[PDB]
Curated annotation (Swiss-Prot):
Quaternary structure and interacting proteins, as annotated: Homo-multimerizes. Interacts with ARRDC4.
Predominant location: cytoplasm
Organism of provenance: Homo sapiens (Human)
Keywords, comma-separated and alphabetical: Acetylation, Coiled coil, Cytoplasm, Immunity, Innate immunity, Isopeptide bond, Metal-binding, Phosphoprotein, Transferase, Ubl conjugation, Zinc, Zinc-finger
Listed GO biological process terms: antiviral innate immune response; negative regulation of inflammatory response; negative regulation of NLRP3 inflammasome complex assembly; positive regulation of autophagy; positive regulation of interferon-alpha production; positive regulation of interferon-beta production; positive regulation of protein oligomerization; protein K48-linked ubiquitination
Signal peptide: none
Single GO MF annotation: ubiquitin protein ligase activity
The name this protein goes by in its record: E3 ubiquitin-protein ligase TRIM65
Portion held of the full protein: 313 to 502 of 517
Domain (B30.2/SPRY) ranges: 1-190
Amino acid sequence: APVPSTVCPLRRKLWQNYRNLTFDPVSANRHFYLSRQDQQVKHLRQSRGPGGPGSFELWQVQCAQSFQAGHHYWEVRASDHSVTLGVSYPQLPRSRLGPHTDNIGRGPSSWGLCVQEDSLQAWHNGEAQRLPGVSGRLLGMDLDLASGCLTFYSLEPQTQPLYTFHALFNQPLTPVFWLLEGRTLTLCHQ
């Protein structure tokens, strides 16, 4: 039950390519609890045992959808800061070889936007751009695979682009997310 408000005409244009995403439970870190027909995930303190083969040792989970040409848009609601929203090629590593728990945008195969307490970090290839923080927790990802552009949006209180990456994407892209303990992410459907 999203609160009614008149949809911004720019946001309505983005929705012309809206995609309804679901999480992939095989990928999910063993501490992650999925609900709402796999539209919602929460990082819990208590583990669910060994999640199994293919599960992220990082604090991550990916979606069951991938994208390769065309133009695609979706929205996600975060319960709080300290989440990362991104896309990756299929080769993104699942293991935690070191102290870091988030590898989204830490190599050439993924791109991500991490929401922090008082800033944003736009990650690719192990480099982050530090951007001004936002208070809104409703975030959009616009993936134009015709032009090779990925743009992150904040949708509340206005529709505002946050950062755009350009790339010549050469494999299908799968949405992928990082969550600190206690955080919930909800894949919004339209």
